[PDB]
Design a protein around this ligand. Structure first.
Ligand SMILES: OC[C@H]1O[C@@](CO)(OC[C@H]2O[C@@](CO)(OC[C@H]3O[C@@](CO)(OC[C@H]4O[C@@](CO)(OC[C@H]5O[C@](O)(CO)[C@@H](O)[C@@H]5O)[C@@H](O)[C@@H]4O)[C@@H](O)[C@@H]3O)[C@@H](O)[C@@H]2O)[C@@H](O)[C@@H]1O
Ligand SMILES: [Mg+2]
Lengths: 99, 50, 91, 63, 497
């Protein structure tokens, strides 16, 4: 097992997100290749659910519901967090030889 | 041998999916203009069926 | 069980128009059947006598029925679930 | 140049809203279309550029 | 994921609601919109089989407007039988199907539906509109008779104006078809008699229209002791539904025979406002129900009624015909629709802006005072009673009303003007349309609003019926206001299901 972390990075690289963050948040302090995205809290199943959820563009019955991270009442760019980590918990292997 | 054969829609499944998308969006599926003619109706609850 | 019950492998064609006692030409590119009659003809009462098609092909217009041909008439040929639409006009 | 002319003249919001309302009948794309008075008449400054030049670029009004 | 529920009951802030693709009470299919209802009573199934035209926002340029069947028995519940009669080819005369009629023949156990086919881009020698017939053995599958072509120009009528075949059988045993056509620049409802519905004889002209107007979807019937002709005015400035009364068929024909103007009542035969069109009636033997379509608004704006004439098609709306002792006709809520509302919702005041006072269920309002209630739901039934000081008061019911609502849409019942007016209040103060009705002499009004999603029908003391398309009205507060007189409102009850 192993853990990877980026400690320093040029400002332009952190902004463009070549090494992670998708250009939304800086990858510094996170694993190499980590990605920032929305959080899908299931799908809408009724107009009552759509109305109860925070307002978002294109919300309708049967559509993906996105969590409001900052609880501002509207889904926008700021409602994104760290969702992807390309680091396995542990990698193992086993070899058996029977004669 | 190829094992991870990705499952994709055949002709009937593709037509069914297109009809489902059209009726979900409220447009007329017969207007697909892809050569598909759909015989379809509504059930007791009003949900479209093909 | 991957195969779907579509039986699409079926030929659909029309190759015989026999309105009353008149023949006509068929253009498959434009899906048209054009039948010529003299300048004086009743046209309001035409019967279909010979409308053979490809093997297993079924058409909406049957034999023995009468159709007014003052305007182009749409015909649908459906051997299975494969359909083809032509238009029949009379000059 | 039509959009730039509308923005320069200042009637861009009204013209675009009227166009949306008129064309929603014959086009379903404009079903949810809506123009904001002081936001949508100029493209926002790119977020990547703002982040790269920290404390130097200010986003346009309304964004 | 834990779902969060907002405080719907307890807030009066304006909320952006939405309309589902399907409707339950005022029927609307999940796909397309209802236009030009064609009601019919099935003698076998003992129910109501209303057909219509399935309009779409992107209609095809050549072939469109098929016929879809809807089965009902009470006017509240509706099931769909799918497409019944399909539109023809591009070059066929029935590329676009117009409004028609339906009649059953026990002689051959066959349903005959007579519709209107519209030629796409007709030529000079081609009739624009032709009446056709389709036969069904069990109302499910329909076969069009290709040998039937009732050309309008054959009998000297207009080629481009030959519409709305309405069929009815009289006691003598002969079927009569009424066609709303034009002759030598004058609107004529022509009559064709038949004994087997296969051969027709033009029995002259049934009736003439009033002041060179056009009548859409004529419907002649008999209700007890009077003969009634329901029609829809095609004139852009009117765009409403009127009717004519007559003791016998001869009297009905003699009505407006030549600019006579024998109006059935003092309101020129008004039934409903601009939001109700193509009203056609059918009777099951005990009650008569009229079906029409409430139109939609472009851009989902209630104030965007539109110039000349509104948008076509919309939501199917069913009302119950009520015949008074003088022969006048008024529209009432169907009994099934009224009884469907079972659950009751508590009502309480949200805003206190005017000088009104509260004494329990009774609220007294002066001029310039208004009261705002709690939010509504998807389906609402609001019933109350308003007593005015005199017969010159202006009270009103406002929907899409909130604390921060810049504009709200109101119906003002003006007793001095003797009518009701649907207008837009707020920062625009726009007048949309109106509807005349009979002012009670006791200054008492029994107001009942039945609203499904975005279509609401208001009934005033069984004397006024007022249909409206008000988007965003569901899940939003409603208010009562007074402008010039003094009013006292009581018995406010809100029911939802
Ligand atoms: O499809 C194009 C666009 O316009 C509509 C408006 O309905 O479709 C037009 C299309 O509808 C037909 C049959 O499909 O008639 C509509 C049916 O509804 C009736 C009322 O019962 O007519 C009301 C409707 O007719 C209008 C506009 O169509 O005027 C009729 C028009 O026909 C003339 O003859 C043209 O030469 C003129 O008399 C007049 O200008 C308008 O007054 C009303 O809104 C029935 O009469 C009829 O059965 C066809 O008649 C027409 O071509 C929409 O569907 C679509 O968005
Ligand atoms: Mg947020």
């Amino acid at each position: 097992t192993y853990r990877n972390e980026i400690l320093e990075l040029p400002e332009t690289v952190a902004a463009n997100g070549k090494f992670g963050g998708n250009g939304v948040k800086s990858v510094v302090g996170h694993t190499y290749g980590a990605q920032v995205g929305y959080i899908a809290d299931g799908i809408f199943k009724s107009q009552d659910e759509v109305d109860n959820h925070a307002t978002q563009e294109g919300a309708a019955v049967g559509r993906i519901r996105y969590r409001d991270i900052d609880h501002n009442g509207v889904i926008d760019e700021r409602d994104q967090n760290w969702i992807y980590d390309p680091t396995p918990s542990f990698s193992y292997g086993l070899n058996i030889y029977l004669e | 041998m190829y094992q991870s054969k990705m499952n994709v829609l055949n002709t009937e499944q593709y037509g069914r999916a297109m009809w489902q998308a059209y009726v979900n969006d409220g447009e007329n599926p017969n207007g697909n203009a892809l050569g598909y003619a759909y015989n379809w109706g509504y059930n007791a609850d009003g949900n479209p069926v093909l | 069980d991957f195969k779907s019950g579509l039986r699409l492998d079926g030929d659909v064609w029309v190759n015989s128009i026999r309105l009353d006692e008149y023949a006509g030409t068929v253009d498959y590119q434009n899906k048209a059947i054009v039948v010529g009659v003299p300048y004086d003809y009743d046209i309001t009462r035409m019967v279909v006598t010979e409308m053979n098609l490809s093997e297993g092909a079924k058409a909406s217009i049957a034999i023995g029925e009468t159709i007014d041909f003052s305007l182009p008439v749409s015909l649908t040929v459906k051997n299975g679930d494969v359909q083809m639409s032509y238009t029949i006009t009379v000059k | 140049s039509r959009f730039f002319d509308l923005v320069r003249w200042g009637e861009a919001k009204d013209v675009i809203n009227a166009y949306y309302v008129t064309e929603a009948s014959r086009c379903s794309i404009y079903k949810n279309a809506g123009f904001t008075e002081n936001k949508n008449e100029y493209l926002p400054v790119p977020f990547e550029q703002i982040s790269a030049s920290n404390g130097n670029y200010t986003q346009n009004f309304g964004w | 994921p834990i779902l969060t529920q907002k405080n719907w009951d307890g807030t009066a802030t304006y909320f952006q609601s939405s309309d589902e693709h399907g409707f339950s009470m005022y029927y609307k299919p999940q796909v397309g919109f209802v236009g030009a209802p064609m009601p019919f009573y099935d003698p076998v199934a003992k129910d109501f089989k209303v057909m219509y035209l399935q309009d779409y926002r992107p209609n095809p340029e050549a072939t469109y407007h098929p016929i879809f069947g809807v089965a009902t028995k009470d006017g509240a519940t509706y099931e769909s039988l799918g497409e019944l009669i399909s539109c023809g080819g591009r070059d066929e005369q029935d590329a676009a199907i117009g409004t028609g009629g339906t009649i059953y023949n026990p002689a051959d156990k066959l349903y005959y539906t007579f519709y209107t086919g519209n030629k796409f881009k007709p030529s000079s020698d081609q009739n624009a509109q032709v009446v056709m017939v389709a036969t069904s053995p069990d109302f499910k599958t329909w076969t069009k008779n290709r040998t039937f072509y009732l050309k309008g120009d054959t009998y000297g009528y207009d080629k481009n104006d030959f519409r709305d075949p309405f069929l009815f059988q009289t006691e003598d045993g002969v079927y009569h078809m009424l066609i709303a056509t034009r002759k030598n620049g004058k609107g004529h409802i022509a009559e064709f008699t038949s004994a087997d519905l296969k051969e027709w004889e033009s029995a002259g002209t049934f009736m003439t229209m009033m002041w060179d107007r056009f009548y859409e979807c004529p419907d002649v019937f008999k209700m007890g002791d009077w003969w009634y002709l329901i029609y829809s005015e095609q004139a852009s400035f009117m765009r409403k539904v009127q009717y004519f009364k007559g003791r016998t068929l001869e009297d009905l024909k003699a009505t407006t025979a030549n600019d006579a103007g024998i109006w059935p009542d003092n309101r020129e035969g008004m039934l409903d406002s601009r939001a109700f069109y193509a009203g056609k009636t059918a009777s099951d033997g005990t009650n008569r129900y009229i079906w029409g379509w409430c139109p939609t608004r472009a851009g989902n704006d209630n104030g965007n009624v539109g110039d000349v004439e509104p948008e076509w098609a919309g939501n199917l709306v069913a009302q119950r015909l009520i015949q008074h002792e003088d022969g006048t006709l008024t529209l009432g809520v169907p009994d099934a629709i009224d009884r469907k509302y079972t659950s009751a919702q508590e009502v309480k005041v949200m805003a206190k802006d005017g000088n009104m006072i509260e004494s329990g269920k009774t609220y007294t309002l002066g001029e310039g005072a208004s009261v705002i209630f709690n939010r509504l739901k998807v389906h609402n039934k609001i019933s109350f009673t308003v007593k005015t000081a005199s017969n010159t008061d202006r009270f009103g019911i406002s929907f899409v009303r909130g604390t921060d609502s810049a504009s709200w849409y109101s119906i003002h019942v003006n007793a001095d003007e003797g009518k009701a007016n649907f207008e837009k209040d707020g920062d625009d103060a726009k007048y949309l349309f109106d509807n005349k009705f009979n002012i009670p002499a006791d200054n008492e009004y029994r107001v009942t609003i039945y609203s499904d999603q975005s279509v609401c029908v208001t009934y005033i003391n069984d004397q006024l019926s007022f249909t409206n398309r008000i988007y965003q009205m569901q899940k939003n507060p409603w208010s009562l206001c007074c402008y010039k007189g003094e009013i006292t409102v009581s018995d406010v009850q809100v029911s939802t299901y």
